[PDB]
Amino acid sequence: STGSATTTPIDSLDDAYITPVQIGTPAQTLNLDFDTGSSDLWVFSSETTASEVDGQTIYTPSKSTTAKLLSGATWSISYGDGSSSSGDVYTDTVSVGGLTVTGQAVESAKKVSSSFTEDSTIDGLLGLAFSTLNTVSPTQQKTFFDNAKASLDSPVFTADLGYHAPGTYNFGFIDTTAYTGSITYTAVSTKQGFWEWTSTGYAVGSGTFKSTSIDGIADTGTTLLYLPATVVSAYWAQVSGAKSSSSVGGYVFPCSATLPSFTFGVGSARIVIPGDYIDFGPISTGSSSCFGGIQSSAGIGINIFGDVALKAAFVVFNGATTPTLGFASK
């Protein structure tokens, strides 16, 4: 089997991407944030504290003839940006782009933190990291990909995120028309439960390539590119007027600037992030100070190849016995 679904930016800045997901019988379609940095599939639901729902589409398991309460199971998660959610668990039928999993754990939110409530466009998350990170207790549950894997034509999924445009998540096949040149594959460590890999270095604009190992995670659920302070300083030094602002919470730059590109290494190959991808607009409405898309990972504890990086590439998440990551230009 295979599946193919379109993923769409939630706003004009590409702050996140939503992908429609069918849950239950008859289908209830929810728009979920596919997140290769976590491993829970959770949804706004009929059980969510009413004051914490503001415009989201909810899953109502009592209206699904295939929903079954997973007795005794609870879940609770906290994300790197400080947001959180928790609740109980159903199993139900879940389909993505024509690909169907029966008995998928659907984690029903009783509580969500304010940032989720305030984002009316995201109805929940669909985790695509390794199932070892799944928070369901006392019996850990598998991700959608993990459940689908054995049935897929090939045990892979691909992320093809658009810049200010729709893109595609495919399951079970590699669309050879969706990228240019060849796919370069690179080793993955699953030791922390993430799609963790080591970039071979970077360049700023038309500058020379610096060969240096950068360990980080491929994370579709993080907006920006978070890299070591040395790398990030080298980038923003090429933008007149750019500075790190403690009060804003990162590097800002004059909105009148032209940003240089940023290149990262995948083995001997190179992925180029155009300067425009690194512009996240005014820090506040009407400001001429703009927020940067490359930020320091210092104090995160891990480097994160988030959407800013990933949307510059066609990315293969290879879930073979020994997982690997593939990157192609497009």
What is residue 212's DSSP assignment? E
Class of domain 175-330: mainly beta
Place of tokens 């009592």: 62
Produce one character per residue of 133-156: b if its CB has 16 or more CB atoms within 10 Å, e if not: bbbbeeeebbbbbbbbbeebeebb
Structure tokens at 296: 């320091």
Q: How far is CA 55 from the centre of its chain?
A: 22
Structure tokens at 276: 């425009």
Q: How far is CA 99 from the centre of its chain?
A: 20
Residues 5 and 128: their CA atoms lie apart, in Å, by 15
Residues 105 and 38: their CA atoms lie apart, in Å, by 14
Q: Count of CB atoms within 10 A of residue 321's CB?
A: 5
Q: Beta strand pairing status for 17-23 and 28-35? A: antiparallel
308 phi/psi in degrees, rounded to 5 = -55, -40
Whether 211 is catalytic is no
- Is the preceding omega at residue 138 within 30 degrees of 0, hence cis? yes
CATH superfamily of 5-174: Acid Proteases (2.40.70.10)
Q: Identify the three-state secondary structure at position 66.
A: coil
Q: Do domains 5-174 and 175-330 have the same CATH topology?
A: yes
Tell how many helices (H) and how many strands (E) occur in the chain.
4, 24
Residue pair 43/144 in contact by the 8 Å Cβ criterion:
no
In what helix (H) or strand (E) does residue 235 lie, and over which residues does it extend? helix 229-236
Residues 175 and 114: their CA atoms lie apart, in Å, by 38
From the list 38, 95, 199, 296, the catalytic residue is: 199
From the list 35, 123, 146, 307, the catalytic residue is: 35
Whether 35 is catalytic is yes
Single-letter amino acid, residue 146: D
Q: What resolution in angstrom units was achieved for this structure?
A: 1.6
Place of tokens 């923003």: 236
Domain segments of the chain: what residues?
5-174, 175-330
List Cβ neighbours of 110 (8 Å cut-off, separation of 6 or more): 47, 48, 49, 86, 87, 88
Q: Identify the three-state secondary structure at position 216.
A: strand
Query: Terminal CA-to-CA distance of the chain, rounded, Å?
Result: 25
What is residue 54's DSSP assignment? S
